């Protein structure tokens, strides 16, 4: 049974919680490699689960993302409530988070003629909020997540209580131990793509990023640029345009967060300081976001 370490503590296969395969049910496919499932334990559960026509380092990858989720502890990251490893297909059991990933909610959830008040700059703001408070958690426990951003994000609910939570760590799995084609290039700073150096500051640049999804609704970053034109285009310097009618506040964010050192660039302590003096700037969060 392989190792992991979090917060200078050692677990192992052996301290997951397995649950009984009997006591869990499928209800509904909810969607790259394996499948996700509303399923139930009665306690409500999304189910993840390992294709059995899968190599021995697919098996290692689906319990070391086991191990990793399990040993956070923090509102803003998805629960583990425990797997299923003795018996085929393998499951790993998470908090159900209803609202789906952030990306597709960003992009079905927007102000249209038929939904002119589906969301708010408010809501955009607590969306940032809650991800930094995530992130801010990963940092101070020294853990680097490698790939912050909206399709990694997700909602316990698509209704004004929603909470956003970091809710998948593939990349930092790989890491911990894919291809080029296959980086999140247009989340990643200058240092990252050229050097291979990984920080915390790493993070600050992503964040950054997903901050440009979340006021832009969903966007792609770095609209009609291919990945080797973002790297170029952000090795010379250049940053992204605010989204439409985002607030210069918000946007100062975004550019702090995009300094090409990463010692100028912000923690997540302060990052979520100017989130939240965004929040209470009456001029911020009444200003009205685009209808299409």
Known sequence: ??????????????????????????????????????????????????????????????????????????????RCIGVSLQSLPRFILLELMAGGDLKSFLRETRP?????????????????????????????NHFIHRDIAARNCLLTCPGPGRVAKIGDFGMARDIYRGGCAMLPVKWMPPEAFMEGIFTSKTDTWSFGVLLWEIFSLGYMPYPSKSNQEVLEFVTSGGRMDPPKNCPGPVYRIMTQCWQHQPEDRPNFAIILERIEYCTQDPDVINTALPIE
């Open 112 to 140: 249209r003629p038929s939904q002119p008040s589906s969301l708010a700059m408010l809501d955009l703001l607590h969306v940032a909020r809650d991800i930094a408070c995530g992130c801010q958690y990963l940092e101070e």
């Open 1 to 78: 049974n392989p190792n992991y370490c979090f917060a200078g503590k050692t677990s192992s296969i052996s301290d997951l919680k397995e649950v009984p395969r009997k006591n869990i049910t499928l209800i509904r496919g909810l969607g790259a490699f394996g499948e996700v499932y509303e399923g139930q334990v009665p306690l409500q559960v999304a189910v993840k689960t390992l294709p059995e026509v899968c190599s021995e380092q697919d098996e290692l990858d689906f319990l070391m993302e086991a191990l990793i989720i399990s040993k956070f502890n923090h509102q803003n990251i998805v």
